[PDB]
Amino acid sequence: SIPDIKLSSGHLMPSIGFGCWKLANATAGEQVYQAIKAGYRLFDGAEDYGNEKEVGDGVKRAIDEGLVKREEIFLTSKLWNNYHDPKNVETALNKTLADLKVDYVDLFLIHFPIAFKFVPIEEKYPPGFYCGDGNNFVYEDVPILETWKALEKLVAAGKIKSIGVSNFPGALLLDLLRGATIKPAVLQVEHHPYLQQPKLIEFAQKAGVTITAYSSFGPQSFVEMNQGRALNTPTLFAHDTIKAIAAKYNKTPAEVLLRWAAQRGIAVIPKSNLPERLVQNRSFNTFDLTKEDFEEIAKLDIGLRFNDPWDWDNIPIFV
Amino acid sequence: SIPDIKLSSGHLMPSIGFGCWKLANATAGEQVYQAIKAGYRLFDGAEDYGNEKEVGDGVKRAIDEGLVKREEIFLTSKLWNNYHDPKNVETALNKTLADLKVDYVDLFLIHFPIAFKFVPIEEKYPPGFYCGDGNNFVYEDVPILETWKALEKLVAAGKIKSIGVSNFPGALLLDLLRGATIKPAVLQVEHHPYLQQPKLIEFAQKAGVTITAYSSFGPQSFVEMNQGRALNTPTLFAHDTIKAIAAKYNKTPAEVLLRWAAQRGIAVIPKSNLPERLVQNRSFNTFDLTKEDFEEIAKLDIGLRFNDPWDWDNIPIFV
Ligand SMILES: NC(=O)c1ccc[n+]([C@@H]2O[C@H](COP(=O)([O-])OP(=O)(O)OC[C@H]3O[C@@H](n4cnc5c(N)ncnc54)[C@H](O)[C@@H]3O)[C@@H](O)[C@H]2O)c1
Ligand SMILES: NC(=O)c1ccc[n+]([C@@H]2O[C@H](COP(=O)([O-])OP(=O)(O)OC[C@H]3O[C@@H](n4cnc5c(N)ncnc54)[C@H](O)[C@@H]3O)[C@@H](O)[C@H]2O)c1
Numbered sequence: 172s173i174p175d176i177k178l179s180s181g182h183l184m185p186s187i188g189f190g191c192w193k194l195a196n197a198t199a200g201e202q203v204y205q206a207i208k209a210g211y212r213l214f215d216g217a218e219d220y221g222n223e224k225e226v227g228d229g230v231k232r233a234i235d236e237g238l239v240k241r242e243e244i245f246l247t248s249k250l251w252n253n254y255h256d257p258k259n260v261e262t263a264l265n266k267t268l269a270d271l272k273v274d275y276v277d278l279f280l281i282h283f284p285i286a287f288k289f290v291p292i293e294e295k296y297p298p299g300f301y302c303g304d305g306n307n308f309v310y311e312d313v314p315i316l317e318t319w320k321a322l323e324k325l326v327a328a329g330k331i332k333s334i335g336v337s338n339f340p341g342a343l344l345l346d347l348l349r350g351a352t353i354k355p356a357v358l359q360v361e362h363h364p365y366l367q368q369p370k371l372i373e374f375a376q377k378a379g380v381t382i383t384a385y386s387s388f389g390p391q392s393f394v395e396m397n398q399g400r401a402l403n404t405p406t407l408f409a410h411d412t413i414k415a416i417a418a419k420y421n422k423t424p425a426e427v428l429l430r431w432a433a434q435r436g437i438a439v440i441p442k443s444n445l446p447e448r449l450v451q452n453r454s455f456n457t458f459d460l461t462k463e464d465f466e467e468i469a470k471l472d473i474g475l476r477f478n479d480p481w482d483w484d485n486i487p488i489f490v
Numbered sequence: 491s492i493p494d495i496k497l498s499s500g501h502l503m504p505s506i507g508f509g510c511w512k513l514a515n516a517t518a519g520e521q522v523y524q525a526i527k528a529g530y531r532l533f534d535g536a537e538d539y540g541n542e543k544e545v546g547d548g549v550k551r552a553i554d555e556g557l558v559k560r561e562e563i564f565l566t567s568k569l570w571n572n573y574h575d576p577k578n579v580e581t582a583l584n585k586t587l588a589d590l591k592v593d594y595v596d597l598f599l600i601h602f603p604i605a606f607k608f609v610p611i612e613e614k615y616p617p618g619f620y621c622g623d624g625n626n627f628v629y630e631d632v633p634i635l636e637t638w639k640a641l642e643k644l645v646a647a648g649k650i651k652s653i654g655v656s657n658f659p660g661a662l663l664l665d666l667l668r669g670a671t672i673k674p675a676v677l678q679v680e681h682h683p684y685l686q687q688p689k690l691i692e693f694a695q696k697a698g699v700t701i702t703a704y705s706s707f708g709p710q711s712f713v714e715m716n717q718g719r720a721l722n723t724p725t726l727f728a729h730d731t732i733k734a735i736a737a738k739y740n741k742t743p744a745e746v747l748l749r750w751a752a753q754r755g756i757a758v759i760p761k762s763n764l765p766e767r768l769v770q771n772r773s774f775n776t777f778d779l780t781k782e783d784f785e786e787i788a789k790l791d792i793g794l795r796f797n798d799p800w801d802w803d804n805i806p807i808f809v
Binding site: 371 | 603605630631632633634635658659660661662663664665667668669687689690692693696793800804805806807808809
């Protein structure tokens with residue numbers, strides 16, 4: 172029932188997944204296990220989420236019970252910013268593999284086009300914004316392509332099935348395509364009605380790169396973290412445009428928000444943090460939006476970005 | 491006196507220059523020669539402008555009459571898109587040097603972070619958008635850093651004093667700084683009240699990169715090319731905000747537009763196509779805009795870009 176997308180790598184990737192950012196450690200394993208019982212097969216994780224061992228526990232439990240086999244589960248993880256230097260890339264992936272308790276991850280992404288100074292795993296893990304000097308940000312001179320080639324070698328070694336990037340703007344993705352032997356299979360970016368970036372989506376799709384949207388509910392994820400920008404932003408769940416379209420199809424605003432991406436061939440990985448949302452968030456493909464619906468939703472695009480490294484340390488990723 | 495800006499390379503660059511884009515071949519020499527007599531010392535040219543031989547004639551005449559010496563002139567040129575493959579960078583630079591009739595250029599910029607297929611000079615020069623296959627765009631898989639390293643060797647060879655880039659968004663500039671041995675001394679970008687990109691400016695200046703603005707009068711240069719977007723755009727010369735401020739100081743809108751950039755440490759290279767403009771375009775540093783003036787002008791920033799490769803072939807530089 173959940174459609175698969177064939178990546179440029181030749182592997183299939185479920186079009187609807189389960190988001191693991193801020194999935195609490197104490198309950199992450201139980202939540203992943205229940206997600207698997209509910210039919211989810213892709214888990215969007217990251218070294219920075221600091222809960223890969225627990226995500227690994229939930230998957231292992233489902234496998235041990237015979238609910239699924241490892242090859243039926245799609246695990247995505249992401250290389251954190253302190254690990255871009257080629258000599259530390261495999262080290263970080265090995266930590267991910269050991270925590271997830273698997274021999275390979277299905278998709279491994281460069282989390283951000285930012286290279287923090289390396290911090291040894293024994294000193295702090297996950298390091299977050301820590302760069303080895305108190306609260307100061309410290310960076311290292313590692314071009315993206317050096318990190319990409321280190322990843323390409325790890326695909327040849329069988330430790331990663333498909334590789335991609337997250338939080339890359341068009342000029343950067345284009346330059347990487349010039350040096351890549353294995354083309355990035357996935358571009359994972361913030362994508363919701365207030366930040367539609369239609370030209371980025373069009374370029375990447377035409378290049379054969381698959382888009383995975385994150386924060387499909389816009390400000391909501393950041394409101395939950397007390398972010399001022401998101402708290403100040405009218406919710407998409409109560410926006411008249413979204414509500415009118417939902418009422419027209421007798422669907423919920425959340426279903427409209429997910430379908431809007433899905434219908435355009437964009438993969439989604441919503442955070443389903445309540446049993447009812449688990450079902451709601453994988454059952455929305457029951458109606459089609461029309462060109463007019465897309466034109467009405469297109470009016471919400473105001474280029475409002477909630478996940479921005481400019482907020483961390485004025486890092487110019489999106490300027 | 492035109493203040494100088496000290497570049498990260500150690501060389502001084504006039505903060506006010508004479509733009510050579512669209513300077514007609516038949517009169518370019520005389521115009522450059524008159525600009526020199528009027529006090530201009532920096533000439534912003536490019537292979538794509540197709541008039542470097544004539545710009546060279548104007549500079550040579552002035553040197554031959556003893557008005558200036560080579561060392562007092564700052565010549566900027568730019569590497570066009572078809573010449574990014576390393577082996578073609580020196581040949582393209584040599585063509586520029588032979589046309590300008592000099593042994594070195596003071597500043598050489600990568601014109602766009604775009605790599606068109608190489609076209610021999612004898613086949614077509616300047617090639618513009620021609621890529622060797624009728625009207626089709628054809629590209630080369632040459633990462634920006636390879637091109638940059640080729641430029642660095644040319645600085646070592648004494649053929650270029652300072653190197654830089656043009657039309658680079660923040661993420662791409664940041665990645666280049668990670669691989670660059672000689673840091674880009676200049677970032678030249680479209681810059682006017684409708685496209686302020688304050689964060690990009692702030693990031694580059696803090697990184698020690700000097701900004702050169704082009705199209706300081708906004709839609710005007712593109713209106714002069716029958717461009718649809720520009721023709722349908724309220725001119726900055728009649729915009730109420732600019733008008734009010736020019737009136738307040740008994741300045742022309744053009745002088746306000748140039749000082750707005752200059753007062754913020756940004757170099758300007760206005761195309762002065764009339765004798766009176768020639769004088770005014772380098773004599774506008776006689777007043778300071780106030781914090782409120784800046785605040786008022788900041789309200790015009792709508793992100794309207796007139797020079798966008800997306801219009802050429804949906805090239806994702808700015809998305
Ligand atoms: N690569 C990146 O930089 C990056 C950044 C952020 C998120 N992501 C990924 O994408 C995932 C999803 O994004 P997100 O976590 O920011 O949040 P989201 O937008 O999926 O959900 C945000 C919130 O909305 C609520 N919600 C979910 N389903 C709902 C429903 N049916 N009805 C009403 N409210 C509902 C929940 O409170 C939830 O926490 C993450 O868990 C992570 O895996 C990646
Ligand atoms: N790197 C790049 O991609 C790039 C692109 C475009 C231009 N440039 C450079 O920057 C220069 C300046 O930019 P531009 O030529 O696009 O336009 P501009 O904004 O300097 O001037 C545009 C037009 O306004 C008029 N003008 C000039 N001075 C005036 C004055 N005092 N009062 C009233 N009108 C006046 C002229 O008709 C002129 O053609 C170019 O000549 C070129 O050297 C670089």
